[PDB]
Every structure is written in C-alpha cells, then in structure tokens.
Ligand binder design. Structure first.
Ligand SMILES: *[C@@H]1O[C@H](CO)[C@@H](O[C@@H]2O[C@H](CO)[C@@H](O)[C@H](O[C@@H]3O[C@H](CO)[C@@H](O)[C@H](O)[C@@H]3O)[C@H]2NC(C)=O)[C@H](O)[C@H]1NC(C)=O
Ligand SMILES: *[C@@H]1O[C@H](CO)[C@@H](O[C@H]2O[C@H](CO)[C@@H](O[C@H]3O[C@H](CO)[C@@H](O)[C@H](O)[C@@H]3O)[C@H](O)[C@H]2NC(C)=O)[C@H](O)[C@H]1NC(C)=O
Ligand SMILES: *[C@@H]1O[C@H](CO)[C@@H](O[C@@H]2O[C@H](CO)[C@@H](O)[C@H](O)[C@H]2NC(C)=O)[C@H](O)[C@H]1NC(C)=O
Ligand SMILES: *[C@@H]1O[C@H](CO)[C@@H](O[C@@H]2O[C@H](CO)[C@@H](O)[C@H](O)[C@H]2NC(C)=O)[C@H](O)[C@H]1NC(C)=O
Ligand code: CLR
Ligand code: NAG
Ligand code: NAG
Ligand code: NAG
Ligand code: NAG
Ligand code: NAG
Ligand code: NAG
Ligand code: NAG
Ligand code: NAG
Ligand code: NAG
Length: 1194
C-alpha cells in the first residue's frame, strides 16, 4: 500500500480545491481533527492511525454532506454505506488498490514558489455488490415536504429510472455544483490489469449498524414491514334458526305454556262433560285504642305534631346543594376516583379546554400547483388565504379578552398554561395558525420574482404537517414551524374533515385554548370561570358572515344544565294545582245538589296537601342537619313519590269511613277508632314495606341512589306517622263540623255508597271474574311477560350526554361538529406508579420503546394498540420521555455538554470556552446511561430548552411528566406516557375505550412481574370517573332489585302472619311489574343509567301500594269460595285504590305531558307513566284472576 493524495493547494471555482498529488506512504495524523474522523467514518479509528487524510479535506466532506445527512440520515444503514463510499473514496489507507491517476499538471503558488501537482481527473474501481446493496437499501427513503422518493432530488431526474450506476456517476459529476472534479466510476467485481478493487461489508435497511441504533422504518424501507395487524371480531349472537336467541327461546316457552295450559282446561272440561291472629289482633287493638285517643284529645296531638314538624323542618337553614358533576356521578371511593386522586397529587390536574370549530361555508376549494414539477394538491375551503386572515383576526381578538372580577382583570395570558415558563411566556394555543406563528407578515410572505412563486404558505403548510417539530425548513424557505409557545403542534389536533393522512383536504379548523386547572385552590377557579363566561358571550356576539363557529368552554355543560333546570316550574306548579283540584272535588261524595257545599271535603284536602309538603320539608331538614347534601334528581323525584304514597292512604281512610254505617249506641270516637283499627294494618303494611325497601336500597355506592334512598325512606316513614297522628285528628274535627250542620270553608253560616263503588261492585268485578274471561286475562299477561323477558338483554347501557342538552343550544351544534369533523379524542395518561427502578439495564428494557428494549414493554404495547386503532380505541403513538432522553444524551447528537469545573449544564447555544461533552465518544459511551449517570444527566435534560442547534429539548413536553424526588441520591417518582384516544361519539364507545385501556395496563403489569403488588400501571382520562359506573351497573341492578324484593318479601311474611303463600303471590306480581318495566324501557328507548335504576327501585315500592291492599283484602276475608273472595276484595279495596293513587297520578302525568325538556320527557315522564298504568293494570286486572285461581285458603 501507499497513499495517493494530500492537501489542497489548487482552486477550481468558489471554494472548490483540486487535491494535491503525493504518492508516498500514509502520515500519522496531527491529533487535531480526531473528533471529525469518528463522525465521518469511524472504520479507520484504531489508534496508531497512519491515515493518508487531511482535516482540510474532512471539513469539506462535512460541509458538502449537509443535504445527504438531512435527507438520508433517517435510514442509518443507507447513510452508513454512503459514508463508507466517501470516506474510503477520499482518504482510505489502502487507496492505491482501487485507484489510478491518469492526467495531472503543475500549479503555481504565490507564497513560496514551489510548484504543486493538481489532480484534474482519474478513474475509480467500485464493486458491483456494494452498489446493488447500496441502491437497494436506499431506494425507498422519502423526502421532506413531499411524498416523493429522496433519490428524486439527488439523481438529477425522475425517481422511476435512476439506475444503480448512473446515480453514482451524477454524484461524482461537477454538474450538480458540489463535486470539485469529475471522477469516472468503473464497476467490476473481478481483477483487471492484475489490480483488484475494494469490496467491504454491506448492510441493508433491515440489518442494524450497531446494537443501540434501531432499524429503518417501513416508510423508508420496503423489506422490513410484512403483514398488517388484524383483530378477531366476536359478534356473539346465538341465532338458532335465523332470528335471535331469547326472541325464539321465549316464543317456544310461550307456545309450550299455552298448549300445556289450555289443554288441561279443555282436557278436564271435556272429561267432566293461630300464630297469625296473635300478632294481627294486638295491632288492631292498639290502633283502635290509639285512634279513639286521638279523636277525643285533638289539641295535645296536633300541638306535638306541629312542634315535631317545626323541630324537624328547621334544618333547612343548613341546606347545601351539590352541582359539581364528579361528586354527583362518581362514587367517592371508587377505583377511578382513587386513580384521579393519585394523578392530581403527583402530576397536577388535567387542564381545561375551550375549543372552537370554525368552518367556511361560502368559499370553494382551489388547486395548488407546484412550480418545478409535482402532482396537483387540492386545498379545502377554510385553508384559503382570506379565510386564514379572518380566523387569525378572530384568534387575536380572543386573546384580547379581559373579563373583570373583584375589580381586577383576569387575562388569558394570566390563566392559560405556558409549559416552559418563565423563559417563554406566551401560552399554548393549538391552532393551524401557530405553524405561521400568528403573524400576518409571516403568513403574507412569499419568496420569488414574477410569473410564479417559489415558496408560499401552501409549501410551508405541506412541509410542517409532515414534520411539525423542526426548527428550520432548510430547503428554499428556511422558517421554523414550532409555534409561539414553543413545542410542536400536531396536525390532527387542529384540523378535521380530512381523509386519513391527507391534511390538504381539511374542511374544518379546530382551535384549542388550554387553560390551567388548579388543585386545592378556589379563587383561581373562580378567576378561570369568570374568563370563560365572557369568552362564551363574545363568541355568541361575534358576527363574521364568512364563518360558522361551533364553540365550547369547560364549564359549559354545567351552565347548560343549570340554564335548562328552569322553564318547567310553570308546568310543575300547574301539575300540583290540578292534582289538588281533583283531591278537593273527588273526596266528597255529592249525593244531592242542595247539599253540595256541606258534604264537601275542601278543608280536608288542604290538610292533606300540607301534611305531604310538610313531610317533604321534615325529610329535607333532618338529613340537612345530619350533613347529607342534596341533588337535583331528588328535587324532581321526592314530591311526586311522597304524594303518590300519602294521597292513596288518605283516600283509603276517608272512603273507608264514608262507606261505613254507624252501629247503634256507638259514639264518634269509638266509630272512628273502629274504622281506623280495621283499615290501618294495610296502610301500615304499605308504608313499612316501602320504608324498609328504600332504606335497605341505601347500600349501593352510586350517589344518586344513595341520597334518593335516604330521602325517600325518611319521607315515606315521616308521612305515614304524620298522617296516623294529625290526619285522623283533623278527620275527627271535620266529621264534628259536618255533623253540627255548619257549612264548609268560609265560617259559621250553617253510609254513602259512592259512584265508583256501584260500578266496581256491580259491573266490573263479576264480569272480569267469569270463567270465559280469566283464561284470556292470564294468557295475555303471561304473553306480555314473555315479550318483556325476551327483549330484556337488548337494553342500552349509559347516557348519551347530549340529549341532556336543549334543542336550541350551542352544545348540541358542538356535538354535531365533533361527530362530523374531528379526528382525535381525549388524551390518555398511562401512569406508571412510584416504585420502579429506572437505573438498571432490565429496568430500562421493561419501559422503553427502542432498539434493545423488550418486545412486550409499555411503549411498544401502546404502539401495537395504535396499530389496531378500532378494536382498542387508542389512536396514536405514545410519545415517551425515556426514548427522547436517550436520543438527547447520546454523543453523536451533542445536545448534552457539561461544564468542566462546576458540573453545571453548558447550553447548546454558547460560545464554547472549555465545556466538554457529557458522555465520552467511545464504544462504551454509545450505550444507554445505565448507572448513576442516568440520574446525573436527567434533570439537565428536563431543564433543557428548544434550542435550534440541539433539537426539541425536554422542558416543553416532559417537565410535568417526570417527577424527581430530591434528596438521598434522587430517585425517579411516578411518570406518564401520554397518547390520545379516537373520536368518541356514544356511550358504547366511551365504555369500550375505558375497558380496553384497563386491559393494556393490566397486560403490562402482568409482564413486568412485580414481587407482590407494590405498584402497577393505570390509565387516566377525564371521562373515566363518569363512565366507570357502567362496568358494574348490571350487577348493581341485580343486587339492588333482588335485595329490595327480598326485603318486601320478608316484611310481608312478618306482617301478614306467617303465610308464605300470599307473600309469594304478591312478590311474583311485583317481579312481573319489574320485568315488564324493563320491556317498556326497551320499547320506548329509555336506557339503563343512574336515573333509571332510581326509577326502577321506586317502581318496586309503588307496585306494593297496589298489590298489598288487594291481597290483604283477599287474605283476611271469611267467605267460602275463591271467586267470591276475589270479587269482595276487588269491590272493597280496589274502589279506593283506583280512585286514590291511579286517577291522581294519571291526571298529574297527562297534565305534565307538555314538559319542554328532553331529560325530563324521557327519564321521568315515561318511567312514571309506565310505572303507574303498569302497576294499576297488573294489580286491578291480574291480582283478581291469579288469586281466584290459586289463592290461599282459610
Ligand atoms: C385528498 O388530497 C389528495 C392530495 O394528493 C388528493 O389526491 C389527488 O387528487 C387530485 C384531484 O384533482 C389530483 O389532481 C392529484 O393528482 C393527479 O396527479 C397525477 C400524477 O400522476 C396526474 O397525472 C393527474 O393528471 C392529476 O393531476 C391526486 N394526487 C395523487 C398523488 O393521487 C385527493 O383527491 C383528495 N381527496 C378528495 C376526496 O378530494
Ligand atoms: C376503523 O373505523 C371503521 C370501522 O369501525 C372503518 O371505516 C369504515 O368505513 C365504512 C363505514 O363507514 C366501511 O367501508 C364501506 O365502504 C367501502 C368502500 O371501499 C367498502 O369497501 C366497504 O364494504 C363498506 O361498504 C367500512 O366498514 C370501514 N372501512 C372501510 C373499508 O371503508 C375504518 O376503515 C377502520 N380503520 C381501521 C384502520 O381499522
Ligand atoms: C474494510 O474491511 C477491512 C477488513 O476487515 C477493515 O479493516 C480492519 O478494520 C478493523 C476495524 O477497527 C480493524 O480493527 C482491523 O485491524 C482492520 N484490519 C486491517 C487493516 O487489516 C476496514 O476497517 C473496512 N473499512 C471500513 C471503512 O470500515
Ligand atoms: C410569542 O413568543 C415569541 C418569542 O418566543 C415572541 O416573538 C416575536 O414576535 C414578534 C412580533 O410580535 C416578531 O417580530 C419576532 O420575530 C418574534 N421573535 C422571535 C425571536 O421569534 C412573540 O411576540 C410572542 N407572542 C405572540 C402573540 O406571538
Ligand atoms: C446533489 C448530490 C449529488 C450531492 C452529494 C454529493 C457530494 C456531497 C460529494 C460528491 C463528491 C464528493 C467530493 C469528492 C472529492 C473531494 C476532495 C477531497 O480532498 C475532499 C472531499 C471532497 C471535496 C468530496 C466532498 C463531498 C462530495 C462533493
Ligand atoms: C432489490 O430488492 C428487491 C426487493 O425489494 C428484490 O426483489 C431485487 O431482487 C433486488 N435487486 C438486486 C439485489 O439487484
Ligand atoms: C387588543 O390586542 C391588540 C393586539 O395588537 C392590542 O394592540 C390592544 O391594545 C388590545 N387591547 C384593547 C383593544 O383593549
Ligand atoms: C378596587 O379595590 C381597591 C383595593 O385594592 C380599592 O382601593 C378601589 O377603590 C376599588 N375600586 C372600586 C371601583 O371598587
Ligand atoms: C437554520 O437555518 C439555516 C438553514 O441552512 C442554518 O444554516 C442555521 O444554522 C439554522 N439556524 C440556527 C439558528 O442555527
Ligand atoms: C367576508 O369575505 C369577503 C370575501 O373574502 C371579504 O371581502 C369580507 O371582508 C369578509 N368579512 C366580513 C364580511 O366580515
Ligand atoms: C418477543 O420476545 C423475544 C425477544 O426477541 C423472542 O423470544 C420472541 O420470539 C419475540 N416474539 C416475536 C413475535 O418477535
Ligand atoms: C443558554 O444558556 C445561557 C447561559 O446559561 C442563557 O443566558 C441563555 O438564556 C440560554 N438559552 C436558552 C435556554 O435558549
Ligand atoms: C478539564 O479539567 C481537567 C482538570 O481539572 C483538565 O485536565 C482538563 O484539561 C480540562 N479540560 C478542559 C477542556 O478545560
Ligand atoms: C393482553 O394479553 C393477552 C394475553 O396475555 C392478549 O390476548 C391480549 O390481546 C392483550 N391485550 C392487548 C395487547 O391489548
């Protein structure tokens, strides 16, 4: 061996210098540019160097290689062979093996008069196996600001016919502008002229160059990426013979029942052609004695009753109302609530978002044509220049807003979050205008001279949607697109309406204004909401006819529900008035026209209304005293429920007295005591059954059911007591009044056999209980039960969180805009808890996504999830901090540089006096920082800023994501890896997203193998607390309904004696009511949520109020046969139960039908209507027939 050239003495043109000929042996290097040889081509560095090379040649290599490093450095094995062809081509130590100079001539020096020899031309021997593996490993790499191939800008022609030999000829040719002299390549693998060429090792785009540099992407290499992922779809229908499972299995249960049931009637019809009274008797005696006591002592009883009312109802001064949604819809000690508590303590709370979905309806799409060559690229309507100026005008106006509070201004600049503050203090605005940095100048600046423009905002937009984190364009524009706050703006967060990667076609512009949320501070939250109100008002009062804005503020759902929570008081007041009107007119039997206003019950009706409203106030006041806060659900379900139960008892008592004839020699207090003693066990049964039912129903962890259960239980109990003591006293007084002839309301101016009872005794009970009507009735009811049980498991789960908004609202428009345009959803944070190591080889392999780290690690699993993206609802890649930290700390990048004496961070833009690199540029230094070096360089990384010489830095993105626990060697605390969900439109989507995020977290926790259960991975998103209840709502429904029905069963089997048969008939009928309630639920499209479960547990308690009365009247009766007992029970009790609860509630719902609110009209009106008429129908048409057939003897 020998060298061929050294130095630069000649000059061609510009800075280009001809190499100076010298064919002696290779020189030991002067120790000056040792750093350069390890960056350009490290294959020569095994020191005792003896390289023929020169630092003035090396620095011109590095200067000319600027654009191939930028384009081709994405795929390391490609840029590795390119470096191997140049370093070796220029200054290899065995240069004479593969080179032979042909033409050379002398050069004259103006400095020393010694004539130097330039090298004008020569020939270069290149192997064929190097060029084929080189071109084939580099042909797939894409270019920046285009979808072309990167060879298309470096071959000198189209990328369809640049062969594996002509491209090398174009590179060595001076026609490009870089090569100082043309070199003629000759390609041959075999020795010619006895001289054999160079053939070193080659690596393709799939093989990695070193054990720490990850392989090439499949965007830039066609041999790494194989079959796509695919999930397995389970649909799960049984579908036996063509239609559903329960739909067919029930219809065969029905045909089997109807044939085995009516074939026994037509089979036999053609064949024939003491402990109870001991507890039920002491109660009767007690109520009779106490009833007489109350009629002959009215003053003491009414006084003590009023004192009780006042003492209990004085607790309304401490009334608190809960309106904050997390405490309402999320259990205080649930799993999701504990995860939210852990996240708010270590990383601070999730921010508040104010979006704005602007759209341009008048403008049409236009075409953009690149000047040199390239296919046409169409741009959507909002991406016109005029529309962008108007949106920029709108954004600068939203930043203006001041919104004074407590005589001081509270600006956007004060409340929004600027991640890297105070250095840069602007704040996060996520708008497509941040690519141009919110400046009319930068947006309006074009580069060129007439008849065509070289660059334009189309070119800038196209460059920055592909790579939004660059700090200079470096190709004909030379502008950054980082954004005024500093840190990237991702195109899927700021655009919508495009088609899957093609951001050119965008139809909407999304503009987000993140605002800080504060953890245990209330003054700041009042400041933030004070700004949001004015933001809402401004956007509503913004005219701009070219644009259609769909906006939202963080407090807007709460504001819409508090604005919607009025406008129906005009319906509820008229509802109660019409109810009271019926109570006053229907209680009194008319029986004559000249005696109307004396046998009238107006005063007694007023007394009934005051006892019911008074009961409401006593319930509210006792639980207000105790400290239980109210809710807006309670305020709509409590008057109605208490009205239902209380009014029915009032009718039972008053009509049971009116239809009673007074015995001879019996005075009034004895008669009223007798009637109360004979009617009171049934009322006691109903009231006690509901109180025990509701109170026992206060065991769930659901806040709506918990507070409702407490309030409703106390109200039913207090209302029963208040009736039993005060209403019989007022009833005695009103009988005294009517017997002393005195007229009604004004003052002092001086048996019944009611119209309903003559219909129920004479026409309805005999007809219904005939032998040709009972099989028809039983057939119809088992058929309706069969339908309801069949369509049971097709009921929806959850609430749409939209139908809860008015129809004239802007939030409905915002939800339409989301569903029609948006592509990203709420962010997910995968929090790895405190306790992980991070300063060890295995501890880093379990968490990384990169080269040496595992294939089942955390970052890799979220990446796989994002490759699926429809089964698992995680839309995008993770954005880890540990990969970035490793990329930052590696010696090649050279962002890291420490001060020599102070051990302080020397910045990337600094004058360079003596600060040296942190990690040594040796083979050991290439590796990951596994020891104590990790924790010595991590805070400096998290404090580094986005410098143009370094890259992105770790302050704007990871400062809140990494917690460092100072003192005792400084370990790492809890950290997160944040990605984004897919657009979620319905409750099914939200539950699916929750479930599968939990699944990924549980998977990672399994693979990590923790000794015991010291820590675990968990996902946090904002809606998890609101949607975690629906993962156990089915077992909650089972437990609540089963426990309430068992409580009813037990209370019935205790109070009725020990008769198990009456209890089983009553319980089976209320279970029928619940199953048919679910059928009507499915049929009207009501969904199962936290409102519907409350309404079902209420229906289970009104079902008793019908049943209990009828079944007790049948049971305690001493007639002969079942038919006469059924018609007797029907007549006697059903005349009062149809007039008391049914007609009142029916009048209420039919007047309530003009409601004007959607939430009310779906979950309250329909459920109440269903409950009332279903229970009425069931009781009065199904207890007679079922008791007639299989009722309990005595
Ligand atoms: C979403 O945006 C993409 C942006 O590429 C649209 O694709 C392209 O469609 C436009 C429609 O008018 C074509 O002009 C583009 O190019 C054509 O380019 C070839 C190049 O060989 C020429 O020979 C043709 O004469 C023509 O000019 C076309 N570009 C590519 C790369 O396919 C896409 O249509 C759009 N989607 C919708 C729904 O509008
Ligand atoms: C994730 O989201 C969807 C499934 O959840 C996919 O989308 C869909 O788009 C429509 C339905 O809106 C359907 O495609 C129809 O039109 C195409 C035209 O080529 C037909 O081939 C197809 O038979 C349908 O009539 C599909 O149901 C679905 N995608 C397709 C192929 O259009 C979406 O693609 C999916 N993405 C991924 C990566 O899973
Ligand atoms: C081309 O291949 C040769 C043959 O392997 C390489 O030469 C050796 O390089 C290693 C790397 O450090 C040295 O340890 C050996 O001592 C070298 N052997 C010799 C000179 O006989 C050479 O490095 C390759 N070219 C490049 C640029 O890597
Ligand atoms: C956002 O921060 C940037 C710098 O972090 C501020 O800077 C400049 O904006 C002015 C016009 O206001 C331009 O003339 C300069 O070119 C920018 N300076 C640099 C060095 O980039 C900017 O004012 C801040 N505010 C807004 C609203 O953009
Ligand atoms: C547009 C494309 C083709 C440009 C990429 C090729 C460039 C960067 C390459 C091709 C030929 C190379 C040159 C070949 C010869 C010499 C003389 C030597 O003493 C110093 C390096 C120097 C000056 C090289 C610098 C890099 C170089 C100019
Ligand atoms: C280039 O690579 C392709 C696969 O991408 C292969 O089919 C072809 O044979 C290769 N050509 C060579 C090595 O000349
Ligand atoms: C609104 O913002 C503009 C931005 O240039 C500023 O000049 C002006 O002072 C702001 N305040 C007003 C109008 O109160
Ligand atoms: C606002 O508060 C300050 C006290 O900080 C007080 O001096 C000032 O008079 C107040 N202004 C008004 C208009 O109330
Ligand atoms: C980005 O602009 C040019 C592009 O060639 C580059 O030379 C320059 O160094 C970069 N800017 C800074 C501040 O480093
Ligand atoms: C609406 O668009 C037209 C055309 O781009 C423009 O002239 C006008 O100023 C725009 N703005 C309005 C009406 O506020
Ligand atoms: C994942 O785990 C190891 C690491 O390479 C290996 O044994 C296993 O085959 C890998 N699985 C796949 C599918 O690559
Ligand atoms: C770089 O460091 C110097 C000195 O510490 C400091 O003045 C300068 O603001 C830093 N620049 C950044 C962080 O962009
Ligand atoms: C760093 O400090 C050591 C000893 O303090 C010294 O030997 C070395 O030359 C210094 N390097 C630089 C670049 O100042
Ligand atoms: C979690 O792991 C199980 C087996 O360990 C696998 O079936 C399931 O698909 C994984 N879930 C993911 C990757 O979301």
């Amino acid at each position: 061996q020998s060298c061929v050239w050294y130095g630069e003495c000649g000059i061609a043109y510009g800075d280009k210098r001809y190499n100076c000929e010298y064919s002696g042996p290779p020189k030991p290097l002067p120790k000056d540019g040792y750093d350069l040889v390890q960056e350009l081509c490290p294959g020569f560095f095994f020191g005792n160097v003896s390289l023929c090379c020169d630092v003035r040649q090396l620095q011109t290599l590095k200067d000319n290689l600027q654009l191939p490093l930028q384009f081709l450095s994405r795929c390391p094995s490609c840029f590795y062979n390119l470096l191997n062809l140049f370093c070796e081509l220029t200054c290899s130590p065995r240069q004479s093996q593969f080179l032979n100079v042909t033409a050379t001539e002398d050069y004259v020096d103006p400095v020393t008069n010694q004539t130097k020899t330039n090298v004008k031309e020569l020939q270069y021997y290149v192997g064929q196996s190097f060029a084929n593996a080189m071109y084939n490993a580099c042909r797939d790499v894409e270019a920046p600001s285009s979808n072309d191939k990167a060879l298309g800008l470096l071959c000198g022609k189209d990328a369809d016919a640049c062969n594996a030999t002509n491209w090398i000829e174009y590179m060595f040719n001076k026609d490009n502008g870089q090569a100082p002299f043309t070199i003629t390549p000759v390609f041959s693998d075999f020795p010619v002229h006895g001289m054999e060429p160079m053939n070193n090792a080659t690596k393709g785009c799939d093989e990695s160059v070193d054990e720490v540099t990850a392989p090439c992407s499949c965007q830039d290499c066609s041999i790494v990426c194989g079959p796509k992922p695919q999930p397995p779809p389970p649909p799960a229908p049984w579908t036996i013979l063509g239609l559903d499972a329960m739909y067919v299995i029930m219809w065969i249960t029905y045909m089997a029942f109807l044939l085995v049931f009516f074939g026994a009637f037509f089979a036999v019809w053609c064949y024939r052609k003491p402990v109870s009274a001991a507890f039920e008797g002491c109660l009767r005696r007690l109520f009779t004695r106490w009833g007489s006591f109350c009629v002959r002592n009215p003053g003491c009883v009414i006084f003590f009753s009023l004192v009780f009312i006042t003492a209990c109802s004085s607790g309304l001064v401490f009334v608190r109302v809960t309106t904050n949604p997390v405490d309402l819809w999320s259990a205080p000690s649930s799993q999701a609530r504990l995860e939210k508590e852990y996240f708010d303590q270590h990383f601070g709370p999730f921010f508040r978002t104010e979006q704005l979905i602007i759209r341009a309806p008048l403008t049409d799409k236009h075409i953009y044509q690149p000047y040199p060559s390239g296919a046409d690229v169409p741009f959507g309507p909002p991406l016109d220049i005029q529309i962008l100026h108007q949106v920029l005008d709108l954004q600068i106006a939203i930043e203006n807003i001041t919104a004074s509070y407590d005589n001081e201004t509270v600006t956007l600049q004060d409340i929004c979050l600027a991640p890297l503050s105070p250095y840069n203090t602007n704040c996060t605005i996520l708008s497509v205008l941040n690519y141009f940095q919110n400046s009319h100048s930068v947006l309006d600046h074009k580069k060129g001279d007439d008849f065509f423009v070289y660059a334009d905002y189309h070119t800038h937009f196209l460059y920055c949607v592909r790579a939004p984190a660059s700090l200079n364009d470096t190709s004909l524009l030379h502008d950054p697109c980082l954004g005024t706050f500093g840190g990237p703006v991702f195109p899927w967060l700021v655009l919508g309406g495009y088609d899957d990667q093609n951001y050119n076609n965008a139809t909407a512009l999304v503009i987000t204004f993140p605002v800080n949320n504060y953890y245990n501070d209330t003054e700041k939250l009042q400041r933030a909401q004070a700004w949001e109100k004015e933001f809402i008002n401004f956007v509503k009062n913004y005219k701009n006819p070219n644009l259609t804005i769909s906006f939202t503020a963080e407090r807007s759902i709460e504001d819409e529900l508090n604005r919607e929570s009025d406008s129906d008081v005009f319906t509820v007041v008229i509802s109660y008035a019409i109810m009271f009107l019926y109570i006053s007119l229907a209680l009194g039997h008319m029986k004559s026209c000249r005696r109307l206003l004396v046998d009238s019950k107006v005063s007694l009706g007023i007394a009934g209304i005051l006892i019911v409203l008074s009961s409401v106030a006593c319930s509210l006041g006792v639980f207000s005293y105790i400290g239980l806060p109210l809710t807006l659900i309670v305020i709509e379900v409590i008057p109605f429920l208490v009205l239902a139960v209380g009014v029915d008892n009032i009718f039972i008592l008053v009509q049971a007295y009116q239809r009673d004839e007074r015995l001879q020699g019996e005075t009034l207090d004895q008669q009223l005591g007798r009637v109360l003693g004979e009617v009171a066990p049934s009322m006691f049964l109903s009231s006690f059954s509901e109180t025990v039912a509701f109170f026992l129903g206060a065991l769930s962890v659901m806040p709506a059911v918990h507070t409702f259960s407490l309030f409703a239980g106390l109200a039913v109990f207090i209302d029963f007591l208040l009736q039993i003591t005060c209403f019989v006293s007022l009833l005695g007084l009103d009988i005294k009044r009517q017997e002393k002839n005195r007229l009604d309301i004004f003052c002092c101016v001086r048996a019944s056999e009611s119209c309903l009872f003559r219909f129920f005794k004479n026409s309805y009970s005999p007809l219904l209980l005939k032998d040709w009507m009972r099989p028809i009735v039983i057939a119809i009811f088992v058929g309706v039960l069969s339908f309801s049980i069949a369509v049971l498991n097709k009921v929806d789960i959850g609430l749409d969180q939209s139908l809860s908004m008015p129809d004239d609202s802007y939030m409905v428009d915002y939800f339409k805009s989301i569903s029609q345009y948006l592509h990203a959803g709420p962010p997910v944070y995968f929090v790895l808890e405190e306790g992980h190591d991070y300063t060890s080889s295995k501890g880093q392999n379990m968490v990384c996504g990169g080269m040496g780290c595992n294939n089942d690690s955390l970052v890799q699993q979220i990446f796989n999830a994002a490759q699926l993206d429809n089964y698992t609802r995680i839309g995008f890649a993770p954005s880890s901090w540990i990969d970035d930290y490793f990329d930052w700390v590696k010696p090649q990048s050279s962002c890291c540089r420490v001060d020599n004496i102070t051990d302080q961070f020397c910045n990337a833009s600094v004058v360079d006096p003596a600060c040296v690199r942190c990690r040594p540029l040796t083979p050991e230094g290439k590796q990951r920082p596994q020891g104590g070096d990790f924790m010595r360089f991590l805070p400096m990384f998290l404090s580094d800023n986005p410098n143009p010489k370094c890259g992105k830095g770790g302050h704007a993105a990871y400062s809140s994501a990494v917690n460092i626990l100072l003192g005792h060697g400084t370990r790492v605390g809890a950290t997160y890896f944040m990605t984004y969900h897919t657009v979620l439109q319905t409750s099914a989507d939200f539950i699916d997203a929750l479930k599968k995020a939990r699944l990924i977290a549980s998977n990672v926790t399994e693979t990590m193998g923790i000794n015991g259960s010291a820590y675990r991975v968990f996902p946090y998103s904002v809606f998890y607390v609101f949607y975690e209840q629906y993962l156990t709502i089915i077992d909650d429904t089972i437990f609540n309904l089963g426990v309430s029905l068992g409580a009813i069963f037990l209370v019935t089997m205790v109070l009725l004696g020990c008769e198990l048969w009456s209890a089983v008939i009553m319980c089976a009928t209320i279970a029928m009511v619940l199953v048919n309630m679910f059928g009507v639920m499915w049929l009207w499209g009501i969904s199962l949520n936290a409102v519907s479960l409350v309404n079902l547990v209420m229906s289970c308690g009104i079902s008793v109020e019908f049943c209990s009365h009828i079944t007790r009247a049948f049971t305690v009766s001493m007639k002969g046969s079942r038919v006469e007992r059924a018609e007797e029970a029907l007549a006697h009790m059903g005349s009062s139960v149809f007039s008391g609860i049914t007609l009142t509630k029916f009048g209420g719902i039919v007047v309530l039908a003009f409601a004007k609110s959607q939430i009310f009209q779906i979950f309250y009106f329909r459920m109440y209507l269903a409950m009332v008429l279903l229970g009425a129908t069931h009781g009065l048409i199904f207890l007679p027939v079922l008791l007639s057939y299989i009722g309990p003897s005595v």
